[PDB]
Amino acid sequence: NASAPFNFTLPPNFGKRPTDLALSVILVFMLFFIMLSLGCTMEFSKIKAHLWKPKGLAIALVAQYGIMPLTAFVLGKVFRLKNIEALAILVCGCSPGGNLSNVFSLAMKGDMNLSIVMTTCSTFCALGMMPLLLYIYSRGIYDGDLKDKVPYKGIVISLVLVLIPCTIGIVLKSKRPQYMRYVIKGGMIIILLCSVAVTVLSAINVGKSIMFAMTPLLIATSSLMPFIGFLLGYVLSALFCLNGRCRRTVSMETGCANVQLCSTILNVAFPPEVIGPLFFFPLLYMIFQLGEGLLLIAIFWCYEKF
């Protein structure tokens, strides 16, 4: 069929819809409340002790950065994927641990301070040295340098939005821990309201429900990536002589990856008419692994009660 661009197109209003800005600000507010309420149940002693012992941090970074990009490249080469799809899956693989994974860590309820220090150190390491590995692993694809194409202001903004609410929570609990219940209830109700609002808004904001036109093997590998990541993290944690409570959160952090930076780099690198359904690939992909995480949650409820 030679080489032709996809018929999918984005309206010009997509650049500056007020609804897009509303969606961005409500997600920022949601994440701020998530992080505040999530750090409201954390203490400084455990995070200091885990910072003193970067053993789990070291193994987490080794699994996420020294192995995950390599296996992502291997799967991309094996699946005979196109240049755009291979670049997208490589960027997803080299992406650091997503914030939502910490939420899933709350479901794990094991060594939460280790989880937060691991994810912040992973984001710092990403900001420090992601472009070099991205350029090394993308030989023959996108011959451009791409070094300046990766976002930097977004990474530091995310780092601030992670550190500030957690630090505020630790300070408030250490000094004056007397208003836990009201803050928790308000956070929960506002979180539910914002979730309902975003669920209502995104359905009409996305549009063009042609996400099923994607080729089957790309969907298969997008589903396999979180599974293989979780399996590799669990195996590395178990074979390295780590206790069970301290390994589930590390495995879940390693398996989950952020997709916002991948979306931003995909949109800045390529026009939206050139990209077909892959523009909707990351937003669904994380959702997919969320469901996968839910399955793991069931497995947890198959072990804690039994």
Epitope: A2, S3, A4, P5, G76, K77, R80, L81, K82, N83, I84, A86, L87, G140, I141, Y142, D143, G144, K149, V268, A269, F270, P271, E273, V274
Partner: antibody, heavy 121, light 113 residues
Framework: EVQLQQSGPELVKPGASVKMSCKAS????????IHWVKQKPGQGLEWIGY????????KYNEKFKGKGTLTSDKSSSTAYMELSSLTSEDSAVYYC??????????????WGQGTTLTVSS | DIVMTQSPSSLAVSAGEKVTMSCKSS????????????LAWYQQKPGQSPKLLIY???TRESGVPDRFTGSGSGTDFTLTISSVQAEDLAVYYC????????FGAGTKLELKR
């Protein structure tokens, strides 16, 4: 279909300061990238470099890295190529070609009619 | 870098004599991940802009005569015309785009006397 229009024949002094414009308005100009090919009389084609207008990215050959310069105009949907360094031997024919670019330029499916650049006294 | 060298560089065919232009390139310009075999065969009539004939070295552009066939793999490629007409006299460069855009020396077609 789509056609590519060149600026036209150019006769310039060895004082440089020459610019070549290629126009193509038959599609979405940001969906494809534009290459420039230099041909000497009876010596075959020679590649110079390409430009992607969406990100305003430019890549040049090793020989043409020093002199080659590519710019794009989305409003005019045009590609401008400049050297700023010419010699008497530099006279040639320059073609602008349109190609798809996912990770690697595929092929030059459409070409312009060509611009004959001459440098002399 | 990759450089293209064409062995014959000049031949003459009257009506139906085999042509079989071949350029061996430099190394294996075959993508392992994507089975595309990056290569392009162009046609440049005198006093005219080059016209694309074959892309991916196996598939021909729509609208060209079926007499233009291209078969090859790895480093060995061959373009055959078979029934050569009076309008088929041009220059072919077998341009490659695996790593860098480089053009071949060019082969000229004439008429035997």
């Amino acid at each position: 279909e789509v056609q590519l229009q060149q600026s036209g024949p150019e006769l310039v002094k060895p004082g440089a300061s020459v610019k070549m414009s290629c126009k193509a308005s038959g599609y979405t100009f940001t969906s494809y990238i534009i290459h420039w090919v230099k041909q000497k009389p009876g010596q075959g084609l020679e590649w110079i470099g390409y430009i992607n207008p969406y990100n305003d990215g430019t890549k040049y050959n090793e020989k043409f890295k020093g002199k080659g310069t590519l710019t794009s105009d989305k409003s005019s949907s045009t590609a401008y190529m400049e050297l700023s360094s010419l010699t008497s031997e530099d006279s040639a024919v320059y073609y602008c070609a349109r190609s798809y670019y996912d990770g690697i330029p595929h092929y030059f499916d459409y070409w312009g009619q060509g611009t004959t650049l001459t440098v002399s006294s | 870098d990759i450089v293209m060298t064409q062995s014959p560089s000049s031949l003459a065919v009257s009506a139906g004599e085999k042509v079989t232009m071949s350029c061996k390139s430099s190394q294996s310009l075959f993508n392992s991940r994507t089975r595309r075999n990056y290569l392009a065969w162009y046609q440049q009539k005198p006093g005219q802009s080059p016209k694309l004939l074959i892309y991916w070295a196996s598939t021909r552009e729509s609208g060209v005569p079926d007499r233009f066939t291209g078969s090859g793999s790895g480093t060995d490629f061959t373009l055959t015309i078979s029934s050569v007409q009076a309008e088929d006299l041009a220059v072919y460069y077998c341009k490659q785009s695996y790593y860098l855009l480089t053009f071949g020396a060019g082969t000229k077609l004439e008429l035997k006397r």
